[PDB]
Design a protein around this ligand. Structure first.
Ligand SMILES: Oc1cc(O)cc(/C=C/c2ccc(O)c(O)c2)c1
Ligand SMILES: Oc1cc(O)cc(/C=C/c2ccc(O)c(O)c2)c1
Ligand code: NA
Ligand code: NA
Lengths: 115, 115, 115, 115
């Protein structure tokens, strides 16, 4: 599992469950190509987005649908989504965990990169 | 000030000075139209991006070039940029302050929205 | 301003107004001696805590009553308070801005230290 | 495992390894009694601090020694420690994960509380 995303809810003190996200990869023509997508589990984690073979060097974007998450709880949030854009694997294969901590008007995101 | 952006450096405990950013507005064809841009001042702030009359309902994206900021400090960062995507002015004019707190592998962002 | 504290609300996208805090300074016997206190203004800021002459080397603790803030909004929060503990003025006077971004189950804090 | 602490490094994009922390519980005389302590593993996690039987209702403080962590990396950080103070188990037993994301001049902390 070279790419995992974990999402936490700062209002309820819980994993952010059933949060949709889409991953894109920048194509040679500078456009964003669909790469993978999924929803977080009851643990707030999304595993199995990609494989070592498929997850080549490139610029990737994870777009987390935070707006639908808050709206389902009856909250009108600030952001359309939380976005994480990064170059991956340019020095060889790495494992990436992207974490996001969500509030209605704020988010924090970090990465853990391991060899 | 209809739209102000404030950027802080979590490594050095300082405003993030000379940080470049572009602001885009989503067009009817889902493309990102240029809207505003600038660099942060010595206080870490970017004022004067737009005027009340020009800043109407839309989806806006602030794309902050955090990568160049860290590279100038000899730090290889995780993100290509920090991006903040939000609907603005859907209930008429508001004043928006977007804050971003930067680390090499992480960023936090919040909004203050005032009537 | 030798010491200023700014508090933001990540749920409502606003300054956190009327947030009470006390500041303590560590005594030689490791107890916390009262040093300063106040409540945030309508801008979420607390100015005038100390003067340059009074604010000398020491370990300081800002204890922000976040629990009362959330309870006034009908929200049961996680923390009893947010606390920020730091050495100040060990290289002579500096100006300190402490920022705190509050959610019910989370807080973020940063410092801006200027000569 | 009713209490777990996870610590992440926002500068290096890694778990924060070998971070010491001390847990205290408020005694009947309002003093902080030692409760447990430990160091984070290679995953940045500290497990096994307590048991269901021992982790009674109370006010608890987790004091994470962030200063020693940064100093070992040659960084002079702002905070003496990152502190998390909270009431636990007052509505019956819960499982708590405390997470902290560390930078030299900033930290973010959140809690995941599960039944
Ligand atoms: O931007 C932030 C801010 C924060 O305060 C915490 C996190 C991450 C928390 C976390 C908690 C449990 C995990 O297993 C994990 O991988 C991450 C990310
Ligand atoms: O821990 C954090 C996280 C974050 O995302 C933002 C801030 C600070 C925001 C801020 C906003 C306006 C100001 O004038 C200011 O001094 C600070 C602090
Ligand atoms: Na390469
Ligand atoms: Na009870």
């Amino acid at each position: 599992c070279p790419l995992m995303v974990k999402v936490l809810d700062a209002v309820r003190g819980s994993p952010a469950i059933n949060v949709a996200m889409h991953v894109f990869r920048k194509a040679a023509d500078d456009t964003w190509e669909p790469f993978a997508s999924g929803k977080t589990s009851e643990s707030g984690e999304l595993h199995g987005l990609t494989t070592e073979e498929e997850f080549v060097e490139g610029i990737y974007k994870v777009e987390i649908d935070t707006k639908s998450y808050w709206k389902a709880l009856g909250i009108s949030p600030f952001h359309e989504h939380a976005e994480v854009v990064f170059t991956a694997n340019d020095s060889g294969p790495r494992r990436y965990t992207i974490a996001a901590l969500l509030s209605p008007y704020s988010y924090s995101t970090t990465a853990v990169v391991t060899n």
